[PDB]
Symmetry: C2
Subunit: 96 residues, 2 copies
């Protein structure tokens, strides 16, 4: 079959999407660590907007705490809680 | 609460993930066109593997056809069918 355009557009439109997010990218100051897993799944805004003058951005957010394996040379592996930001609501906004 | 490590790793482990994929990326030979929506959601392999000599790749795939709006600046627009690859099964394999 074929997905009809209106259906394709609505499902591709700006909304919260579970996304794999690199841990080190979120915690840029932890330069001595390697994390396992290296990326975790987090709800993040993504998708289209009606006119190019707009971008998909969060209008509501919250945090989630996860146990992450933190590995630094000579310190063996540690399992530690790390907090990550999630997007609960998304809307199209003018590119500032 | 806190998501326990075993669950964190399991949810982060190589598997098919609904991913927003840039159409022009899947069809880089379609220069003249602006697609709308510019990206669509497709199931794509993503996630961690146990050791770094491995990468998450598809081991079963399929196709999905969607009606996409094709725009040629100052030339009008057409709604047309476009085929996209989908990943149905993923596995961690050597980075040959």
């Amino acid at each position: 079959m074929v997905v009809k355009f209106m259906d394709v557009y609505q499902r591709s439109y700006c909304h919260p999407i579970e996304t794999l997010v690199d841990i080190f990218q979120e915690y840029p100051d932890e330069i001595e660590y390697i994390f396992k897993p290296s990326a975790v799944p987090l709800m993040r805004c993504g998708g289209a907007c009606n006119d190019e003058g707009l971008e998909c951005v969060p209008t509501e957010e919250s945090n989630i705490t996860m146990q992450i394996m933190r590995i630094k040379p000579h310190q063996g592996q540690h399992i530690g809680e790390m907090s990550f930001l999630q997007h609960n609501k998304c809307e199209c906004r003018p590119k500032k």
